Amino acid sequence: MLTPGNPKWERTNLTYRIRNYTPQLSEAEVERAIKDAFELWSVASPLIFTRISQGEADINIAFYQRDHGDNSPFDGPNGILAHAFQPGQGIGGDAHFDAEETWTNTSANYNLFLVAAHEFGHSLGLAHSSDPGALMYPNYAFRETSNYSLPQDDIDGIQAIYG
Ligand SMILES: CN(CCOc1ccc(-c2ccc(C#N)cc2)cc1)C(=O)NO
């Protein structure tokens, strides 16, 4: 639940930028999924996420395939859906999504909202949880995204780090 090292952000207002998009969704659906994902965490912590359209942000979001400059190369369809880096500089906090996945804003494989939510947990300093019902569980498992309210274990996790 608590990323080893207890890494966390010192600023409460973090900027993020969607650097690019996946052809499978309009920029809007991606935008929406990403904003809602940050909102899941902001409603359970003091963190406030602000979107910028160009420039460098605290949290860069991007869809890449295979090798993409951080040597945690993606692996084509399925398997690794995405990853993020713990609070830090440059790549720290950034979230990368495998561009070769079947991204969607709905429930089928793979719901971008849910994955982004999960990755942002990492972006904020959360490690994986052993609770199968937790968003930070190691494996992707769809949950009703509509009224989807951050699982309690994840709330405990983020609260433990930021209060
Ligand atoms: C290498 N490994 C990346 C694997 O790719 C992954 C692994 C798991 C998930 C995931 C897990 C639970 C939910 C929920 N609810 C949603 C998405 C997304 C990408 C990581 O360390 N980062 O997740």
Ligand SMILES: [Ca+2]
């Ligand atoms: Ca993959």
Ligand SMILES: [Ca+2]
């Ligand atoms: Ca960053």
Ligand SMILES: [Zn+2]
């Ligand atoms: Zn990456």
Ligand SMILES: [Zn+2]
């Ligand atoms: Zn993870």
